[PDB]
Amino acid sequence: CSDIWALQGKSTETNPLYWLRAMDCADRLMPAQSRQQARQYDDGSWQNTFKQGILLADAKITPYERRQLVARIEALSTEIPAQVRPLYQLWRDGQALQLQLAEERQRYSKLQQSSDSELDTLRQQHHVLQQQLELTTRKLEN
Amino acid sequence: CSDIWALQGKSTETNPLYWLRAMDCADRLMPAQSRQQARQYDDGSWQNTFKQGILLADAKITPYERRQLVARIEALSTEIPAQVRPLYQLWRDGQALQLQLAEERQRYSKLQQSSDSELDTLRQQHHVLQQQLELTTRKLENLTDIERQLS
């Protein structure tokens, strides 16, 4: 696994077995090691961007980091060798669905926040309205 | 792509490039074509069960159906060869996320319904008490003005 990251060349890039190993090796790393290793692959070529994505995906990254990860991976989709596309696609779909999950959890968090604040606003208003009514009833008796 | 599903053997089942090609071909089928193909691989072996899962993955299936497909191949995951395991993990995690998203959307649907019914009732109560107080306040104002002018 120590040797797989440095491999370059036409014969390596177009081999689905290479990228499968790379992804396998990344799963074996500790999240902190994945983040650190990904930093090496910032040249901007599709090969390094893909390698960076594979490593960065296994790190403890933020949802907005993954949003940016997904975007960079989608941008280079046309340069992915035809043989590798089905593997790339499967890995990308995995990153995409993790993003959707993060977005759904955010949606739920916004609904639970807004509903609670709206409910309690009404409950404070119910307290004022109830007392003001009973004060008014009292003043009518006087 | 029509020939790919029929293959069997040690040279094929331990072949990551074979399963990759299968997943690729499954993408090029319509749900009706997927279902018909899946019906022919139901012997119960890990090979067939994996095939079925791949075919039925994008067959417009229910979350319950998805969970069953996942479950059948998961129960035989130890039999999957070392060369194929990394690819199986990718595919399973994709299905696992889909099941998690189905649960999440169901959770959101429940909170949406429950909160809307609780808010509607409380909004209705707020409107009623507003009108009540306004009618009572006006009465107080009116009656006070009469007594004050009298005094």
CB contact under 8 A, B20 and A107: no
The DSSP letter of residue B43 is S
Residues of B in contact with A139 (CB under 8 A): 140
Question: What is the total count of domains within chain B?
Answer: 1
In a domain, A125, yes or no: yes
Experimental method: X-ray
Cα distances from B30 to residues B33, B35, B38, B56, B57, in angstroms, run: 5, 9, 12, 10, 11
The DSSP letter of residue B6 is G
Helices (H), chain B: 10-13, 16-26, 31-38, 46-56, 63-74, 85-150
Residue A15 distance to chain B (closest CA, Å): 10
Dist. CA B20–CA B38, nearest whole Å: 17
Nearest CA to A51 among A69, A30, A63, A71? Answer: A69
Residue B102 distance to chain A (closest CA, Å): 10
Residue A48 distance to chain B (closest CA, Å): 21
In a domain, B141, yes or no: no
In a domain, A4, yes or no: no
Dist. CA B45–CA A66, nearest whole Å: 37
CB contact under 8 A, B119 and A122: yes
Task: Rounding to the nearest 10 degrees, give the CA dihedral for residues B92, A36, A103, A111.
Answer: 120
And the tokens for A103?
């977005």
In a domain, A3, yes or no: no
In a domain, B151, yes or no: no
In a domain, B42, yes or no: yes
In a domain, A5, yes or no: no
In a domain, B142, yes or no: no
And the tokens for A134?
């009973």
Q: Which domain holds residue B65?
A: 4-121
